[PDB]
Amino acid sequence: GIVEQCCTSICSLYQLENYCN
Amino acid sequence: GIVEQCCTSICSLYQLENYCN
Amino acid sequence: GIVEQCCTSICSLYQLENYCN
Amino acid sequence: GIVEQCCTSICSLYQLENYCN
Amino acid sequence: GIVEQCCTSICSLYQLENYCN
Amino acid sequence: GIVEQCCTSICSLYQLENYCN
Amino acid sequence: FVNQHLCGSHLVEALYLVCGERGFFYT
Amino acid sequence: FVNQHLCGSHLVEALYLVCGERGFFYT
Amino acid sequence: FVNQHLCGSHLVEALYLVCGERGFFYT
Amino acid sequence: FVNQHLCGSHLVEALYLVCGERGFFYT
Amino acid sequence: FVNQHLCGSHLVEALYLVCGERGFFYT
Amino acid sequence: FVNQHLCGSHLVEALYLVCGERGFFYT
Ligand SMILES: [Zn+2]
Fold this sequence. Notes:
The complex is a heterododecamer, with 6 copies of chain A (about 20 residues) and 6 copies of chain G (about 25 residues). Chain A is mainly alpha-helical and about 20 residues long. Chain A is built from 1 helix and no strands. Chain G is α+β, with helices and mostly antiparallel strands. Chain G has one domain. β1 of chain K pairs antiparallel with β1 of chain L, so a sheet runs across the interface. The complex binds zinc ion. The site of zinc ion has 2 residues of chain H, from loops.
């Protein structure tokens, strides 16, 4: 979940690249 | 500056970081 | 106002439409 | 996609809602 | 309206405040 | 900086303009 | 359009989306 | 909703408002 | 406020910022 | 950039900045 | 506008509305 | 260029998102 990897826990912007379509 | 780099043309995330204090 | 109706209380499409001119 | 429907052209709420989960 | 004054043309802070409550 | 002046203290129009380049 | 609490800028954006150029009042 | 173009982050904001906690797919 | 044009969401956002609690009438 | 967890509309903002018109799933 | 504390995004948006393409240092 | 130009308020928002309270230079 993007929320666990980014809201519940700290994530970097580069990590979001894996969530693009 | 960052305007000409990101608005006029297209820039990347690292170019933005170049303008952080 | 609309803030009391939509922020403090629960908002809805119908409520938003009522504040249009 | 949604950008062709809503940005290039004009879309309705119904169309927009089609992209909700 | 405000659109004609601030979008179609360039308005000043004073003009923009004309629409505050 | 402006953050300390406007966020920690109060600043008006002519205070923000002082920070424009 | 889901029912929910809409506050601040989001409420302002919601009114613009719904009303558009009809214009609207925010209070 | 109204009759206007929704582009860039404005379109993403529209999706965020209309879909709420259900989420959405920007595709 | 100054020089540039303000349309759509940006105009309503500028109104929200400038007027604040007082509210405003987008018309 | 060394930001901590992104939540709500802030996470959505970050997704659009990185993904752009590639699209993304917000669920 | 309204004499009150301006923080975060509120402050960044206020400086852009006031300074515009004149530029500014947000520190 | 799946990623579009960042101008005006959108460029300032992106800078704040990336730089944070530490600050940035809009020039
Ligand atoms: Zn815009």
